[PDB]
Amino acid sequence: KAFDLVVIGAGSGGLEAGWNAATLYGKRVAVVDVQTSHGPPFYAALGGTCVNVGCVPKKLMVTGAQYMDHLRESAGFGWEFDGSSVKANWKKLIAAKNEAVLDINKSYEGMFNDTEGLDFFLGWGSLESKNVVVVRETADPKSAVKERLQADHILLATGSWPQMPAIPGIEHCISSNEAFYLPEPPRRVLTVGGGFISVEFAGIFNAYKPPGGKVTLCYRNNLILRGFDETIREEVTKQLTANGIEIMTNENPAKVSLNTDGSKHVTFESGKTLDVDVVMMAIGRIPRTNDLQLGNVGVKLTPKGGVQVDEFSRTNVPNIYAIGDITDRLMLTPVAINEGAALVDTVFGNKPRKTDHTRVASAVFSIPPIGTCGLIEEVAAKEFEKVAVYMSSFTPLMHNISGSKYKKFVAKIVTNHSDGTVLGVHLLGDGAPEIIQAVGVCLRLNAKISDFYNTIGVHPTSAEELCSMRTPSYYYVKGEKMEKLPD
Amino acid sequence: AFDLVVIGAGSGGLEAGWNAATLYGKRVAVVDVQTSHGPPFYAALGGTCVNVGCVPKKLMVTGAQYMDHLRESAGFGWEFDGSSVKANWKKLIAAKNEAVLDINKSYEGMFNDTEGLDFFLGWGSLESKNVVVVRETADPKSAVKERLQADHILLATGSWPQMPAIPGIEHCISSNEAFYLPEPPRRVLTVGGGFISVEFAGIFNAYKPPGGKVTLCYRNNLILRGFDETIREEVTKQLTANGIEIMTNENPAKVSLNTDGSKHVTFESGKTLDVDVVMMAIGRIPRTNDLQLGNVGVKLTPKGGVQVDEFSRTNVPNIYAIGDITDRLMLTPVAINEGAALVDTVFGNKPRKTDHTRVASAVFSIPPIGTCGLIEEVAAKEFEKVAVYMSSFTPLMHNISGSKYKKFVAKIVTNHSDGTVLGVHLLGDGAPEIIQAVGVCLRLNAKISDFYNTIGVHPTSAEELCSMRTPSYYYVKGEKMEKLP
Lengths: 487, 485
Ligand SMILES: Cc1cc2nc3c(=O)[nH]c(=O)nc-3n(C[C@H](O)[C@H](O)[C@H](O)COP(=O)(O)OP(=O)(O)OC[C@H]3O[C@@H](n4cnc5c(N)ncnc54)[C@H](O)[C@@H]3O)c2cc1C
Ligand SMILES: Cc1cc2nc3c(=O)[nH]c(=O)nc-3n(C[C@H](O)[C@H](O)[C@H](O)COP(=O)(O)OP(=O)(O)OC[C@H]3O[C@@H](n4cnc5c(N)ncnc54)[C@H](O)[C@@H]3O)c2cc1C
Ligand SMILES: c1cc2c(ccn2C[C@@H]2CCCN2)cc1-c1ncc(C2(N3CCCC3)CCCCC2)s1
Ligand SMILES: c1cc2c(ccn2C[C@@H]2CCCN2)cc1-c1ncc(C2(N3CCCC3)CCCCC2)s1
Ligand SMILES: c1cc2c(ccn2C[C@@H]2CCCN2)cc1-c1ncc(C2(N3CCCC3)CCCCC2)s1
Ligand SMILES: c1cc2c(ccn2C[C@@H]2CCCN2)cc1-c1ncc(C2(N3CCCC3)CCCCC2)s1
Known about the structure:
homodimer, binds flavin-adenine dinucleotide, binds the ligand c1cc2c(ccn2C[C@@H]2CCCN2)cc1-c1ncc(C2(N3CCCC3)CCCCC2)s1, EC 1.8.1.12 (chain B), redox-active center (chain B), NAD (chain B), trypanothione-disulfide reductase (NADPH) activity (chain B), thioredoxin-disulfide reductase (NADPH) activity (chain B)
């Protein structure tokens, strides 16, 4: 049992690395994971966090939640039906999501069965020595050895895990992992955190809650979605509120106790209280380092806690590499994929390649959604003497007719005003995740604002607003926001 | 005494007029036959796109998409009384009419509030090289209202539905009248394979009353000529899957009235069909007849467009033509771009010409199309080595929604000598929005490697464009083969 590559973690990065090494370069590859399909007790599984308890099921569930808006919005276009007959069956949503994820699990299991030199091992991987991965029955080092895999190269690709704050009654709370399997939709739920997971699940629960229900999102600071464009952070807050979600800023739970009926009594640091049926912690995700026994071989962590790597994903230990969320950088599936492919090209393909972590496009599947690529203006204004911001914002016509007039589309382009180079593009509104993909290609080509406004529009779309902005709306000069340039 | 007289207050004409008055302080007259949408002349102030084109058709396709949303919601756990469901066409048209009227009124205000920018109601024609006559009707013998003296004349009158010369053609409508049908037809035949026929087949399919049937006929073998061929076949299948009957290699030979007022269609093959509405959508032709072009000698192309050069100049010195009347790319953003460039050149001292290559466009079919640049059989004739990248897949949601037939198709066509992307063709939800920034990419001469070294946004349909690294097949000297020699 002597492999060219042993991958610990059969997820977005690990599977891309293993498949490429086996099929592009003829190498003998072992991949370790703890389950062959989604769900409790370990949640993630073959396919990784995105497939099993991440991007794939959450996108299905947001899609389900959007029908609340569609069914109401249809009336402005003449659709008539018994509005009081409308009900949402949560069990059906979960059951259908489970079937779709399981189809992917089954597909990947067929990939392993049929692909030469690509072998799957069920169990918990850890480092025994610099060239041996041990696979045990459980995450505990005292559990029994199942096999010892001799490895010329070892790839750490175990992902991240939900961070749970140490408050009394944390044990009465859940994370996103369990939210994917709730037996009933909560009539009242508190999602804790201001990041994409809290926001995305707020909108899911808001659509499936039974009558008399309320979704509350809380966030420790003043404005949700830190790191996103500030106009969009503010507009999403308004459009969430408009759809019935209570957003509770500058608040943070201090404890949770059980009510007589099994509901949860939340007390915030402020002294406020709230009764909910479910408390979902989504305050962050931390690199999954705890079970690998990295200290056995000396693999170093960063001051933040991710596995430390260079730009070629090398740890401090020769022939041990790390990619994806365990490196605690950009926690995105396509970045883990790109890193895995680059690693295998370099190590086995005599084709050195490194992942570019700038100008990466990403999305938030709030309702409506966010699509973004590159720098927000605050960040550009620190790196560039003259920054211009082009901004267009409006409720689309379709949504004046639908009756969802709160659904303002936002398009913003951030440039280095010295040569017009586009530094960032930020979008809020229907179709934004789809619009922004090719924008990432544009930024990788160093597009300037004039390449956008001299491209002929596609009409009628939201995307054509990106090609309709010729004149800055305002500027940052040496960090100072101002409407007109000096002089 | 006008710097510029514009005949046609549409997409191209209003952009030229506004820019000439507000950017360069010029004195501008703009003529159109109606101040607000609808019968009898359909187009009006704002043009075809505002009144009976892109804007109302997009609203109506959006309405039609609810038929799919209501049905697909069930797979995600939504229930409601299906027998209570009605698609109320009258409400749809009423909401659309008010949206269009709002824009009509906005442009009316533009004219009332902008100095140097003046509107004249009536029919414009060329009396002489420097005079536009405005009459009460399209009849050249109708009464004169105004005679506008013009340093420069802009022909921007658009295009008009083509109608075949068959007995009974008068009982057939065009897209113009479809926007104003008082009731949704139970049985409709749309005639033609182009985008308007396809888009309206989807609209009628959603709003038809019980017992209804939409039939689309096309005189040749495969609809949507000029679009990527993989997409033509697959959109045919997905229309069929949603209950539309596609009747290829058929063409109406005559139409008569049944005793209930419905239409009896006889095809050249001798087949017959009874329908409530026959909608002819076989083409749009440049709208030249009423302009009395023979007065001043403006030359036409063999196919009826006003001949222009790259700067939109006719053969008569201070007479120009933009938009659909030039019979090139009949798209609103192209007409807008031609108008703005023309004004920059004539009045701005910055010669600008419209680039008509690599223009992104869409079809709001259900499912929709997004396209930019060359299809592969055209590229194969201009380039010695062509690579075609192709991916088809089912979006995640349609493993749940009950609409398994909704395959997404992504195709990239390149010059295989240097990897330059010559065309991108998309079929599936999101495609019109995806393709806009693809147009920017092609203007930057993106190569295929620029797409596949860009990191995906996940999960989206658009990331498929960044996930194709190896040609599926090639054309070498115009010959299709799976592998290069
Ligand atoms: C709710 C949620 C939504 C998300 N939505 C998006 C989205 O829309 N878009 C996006 O790009 N990203 C999204 N992400 C992030 C994305 O899921 C991750 O960035 C991606 O999965 C990281 O891939 P990875 O290869 O680093 O590890 P993972 O994909 O997490 O795979 C790691 C694997 O390691 C296994 N494992 C762990 N410990 C061991 C061990 N000791 N031995 C063996 N196997 C082990 C786990 O079972 C798991 O299968 C989301 C994440 C979450 C939680
Ligand atoms: C059903 C349909 C759907 C369409 N959908 C799209 C789409 O989604 N996207 C897209 O980009 N394009 C679309 N188009 C095409 C778009 O409408 C045209 O390309 C665009 O309007 C052309 O602009 P123009 O300046 O050439 O003329 P138009 O906008 O057609 O304006 C011409 C104007 O001239 C007026 N007029 C005509 N003759 C005279 C005269 N003698 N005197 C005075 N006034 C006169 C007419 O009333 C009209 O208002 C669609 C067209 C149709 C018919
Ligand atoms: C599935 C199933 C597969 C095989 C091979 C055999 N069977 C089973 C067969 C299929 C038909 C009948 N039974 C391969 C697969 C793959 N799915 C995805 C794969 C990619 N990535 C690599 C890792 C996960 C992600 C690489 C290729 C591009 C897309 C992403 S490889
Ligand atoms: C299936 C499915 C695949 C992909 C890529 C994406 N999805 C989609 C699935 C859906 C969920 C997860 N991803 C690839 C496949 C393949 N099937 C067979 C393949 C091989 N040969 C190649 C020629 C025919 C035989 C390759 C060599 C080893 C096995 C045989 S590659
Ligand atoms: C288990 C196993 C599950 C699935 C779905 C699939 N598989 C098995 C998969 C597929 C084959 C092998 N792997 C879901 C579950 C659960 N859903 C809810 C669970 C409970 N709690 C609430 C959620 C967290 C824990 C409530 C219900 C009673 C038990 C505890 S356990
Ligand atoms: C409307 C209405 C307008 C005015 C001016 C006054 N009033 C009436 C007033 C305004 C406040 C209350 N009522 C202007 C307009 C215009 N609408 C669109 C115009 C643009 N394009 C040029 C024309 C064709 C389309 C101009 C360039 C930007 C893009 C759109 S100009």
